[PDB]
Amino acid sequence: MSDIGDWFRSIPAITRYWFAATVAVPLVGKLGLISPAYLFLWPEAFLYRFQIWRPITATFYFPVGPGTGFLYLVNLYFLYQYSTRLETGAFDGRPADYLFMLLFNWICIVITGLAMDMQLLMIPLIMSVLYVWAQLNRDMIVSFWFGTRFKACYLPWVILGFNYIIGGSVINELIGNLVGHLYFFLMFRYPMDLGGRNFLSTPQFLYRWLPSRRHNWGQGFRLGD
């Protein structure tokens, strides 16, 4: 129900700005001055021809229109019950490492999208992080308030058909899946067995703000014996 308001209000300033941008890129892009058709994410076009209009702007493309706006609604609805879990689940006590891992994963996914020539980027990333999050949350039934006949082993392909009926070029989401596998490799298999070079770098920009990172033990009292 309409409990999202408390969730949004409770968020501090920096994190609420981060998520507000992350979720409001499409409504901002629907300003009406710039058509969404100018962000088709053609890496070949930018590489070969000029394509000044898509330096990095092509990496955040989501088509929403007149007949999809209401559906747009339920989309963000999912993201809510995604973020509420995703922030709490898996990584919840690492605000700086949150930004670090998002940055590395985005670099990987934008590289693999440069390999391809597809259109959508944020939905594949969201579902990728979703499945890598739920692989640590498998075998669990969750049902919302207005639901009592929620069965098992049906949700992923039902959502797949949901996004399949409205639109096309389904295989793009698979590439998002790819980075999730790598991300899974990055907490269970990467940093103990291969020992090769690392393509990821952590800039000092993250360590400059350090949002919460509180570890002081308040104050102390003298005991003696």
Partner 1 sequence: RPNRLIVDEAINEDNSVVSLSQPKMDELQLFRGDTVLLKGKKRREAVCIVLSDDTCSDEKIRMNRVVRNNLRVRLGDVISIQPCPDVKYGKRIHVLPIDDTVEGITGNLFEVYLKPYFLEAYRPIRKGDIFLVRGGMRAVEFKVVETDPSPYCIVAPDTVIHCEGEPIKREDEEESLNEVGYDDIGGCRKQLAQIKEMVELPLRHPALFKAIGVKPPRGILLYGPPGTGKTLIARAVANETGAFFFLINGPEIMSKLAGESESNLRKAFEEAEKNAPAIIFIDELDAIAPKREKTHGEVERRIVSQLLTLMDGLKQRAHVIVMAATNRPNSIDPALRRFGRFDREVDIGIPDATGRLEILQIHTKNMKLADDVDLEQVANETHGHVGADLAALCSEAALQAIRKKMDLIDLEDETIDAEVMNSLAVTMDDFRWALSQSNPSALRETVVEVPQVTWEDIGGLEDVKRELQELVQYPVEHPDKFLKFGMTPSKGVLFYGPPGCGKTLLAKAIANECQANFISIKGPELLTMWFGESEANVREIFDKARQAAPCVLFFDELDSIAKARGGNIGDGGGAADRVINQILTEMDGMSTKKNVFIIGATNRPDIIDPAILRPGRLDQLIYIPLPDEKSRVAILKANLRKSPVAKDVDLEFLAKMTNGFSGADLTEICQRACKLAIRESIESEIRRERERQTNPSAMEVEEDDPVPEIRRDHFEEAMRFARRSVSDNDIRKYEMFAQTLQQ
140 binds partner 1 (CB under 8 A): no
Our finding on whether 225 is near partner 1 (CB under 8 A) is yes
Minimum distance of partner 1 from residue 219's CB (angstroms): 6
Interaction of residue 219 with partner 1, rule CB under 8 A: yes
* Beta-carbon count within 10 A of 21 CB: 11
CB of 186 to partner 1, least distance (A): 24
CB of 223 to partner 1, least distance (A): 5
- Which of 168, 72, 161 shows the shortest CA–CA distance to 118? 168
CB 137 within 8 A of CB 89: yes
Angle separating helix axes 95-115 and 172-188, nearest 10 degrees: 140
Three-state SS at 51:
coil
Nearer to partner 1, 145 or 221 (CB): 221
Residues in contact with partner 1, counted by CB under 8 A, come to a total of 9
Minimum CB–partner distance for residue 222 and partner 1 (Å): 6
Q: For the CB of residue 215, give the shortest distance to partner 1 in the complex, in Å.
A: 9
Structure tokens at 36: 């969404």
Encoded one letter per residue, x for contact with partner 1 by CB under 8 A and - for no contact, window 189-218 reads: ----------------------------xx
Nearer to partner 1, 208 or 215 (CB): 215
Q: Which of 9, 56, 53, 15 is closest to 34 using CA atoms?
A: 53
Three-class SS state of 37: helix
For the chain, the C-alpha Rg in angstroms (whole number) is: 20
Instruction: Give Cβ neighbours of residue 203 (< 8 Å, ≥ 6 apart).
Output: none
Q: Does 93 bind partner 1 (CB under 8 A)?
A: no
Nearest residue (CB) to partner 1, 35 versus 148: 148
Q: Closest CB to partner 1 among 33 and 223?
A: 223
CB 121 within 8 A of CB 41: yes
- Nearer to partner 1 by Cβ, of 154 and 221: the residue is 221
Among 50, 144, 146, 221, binds partner 1 (CB under 8 A): 221
In angstroms, give the least distance from the CB of 221 to partner 1: 6
Burial of 132 (0-12, 13-18, 19+ CB in 10 A): buried
Nearer to partner 1, 67 or 218 (CB): 218
Contact residues: partner 1, CB under 8 A:
217-225
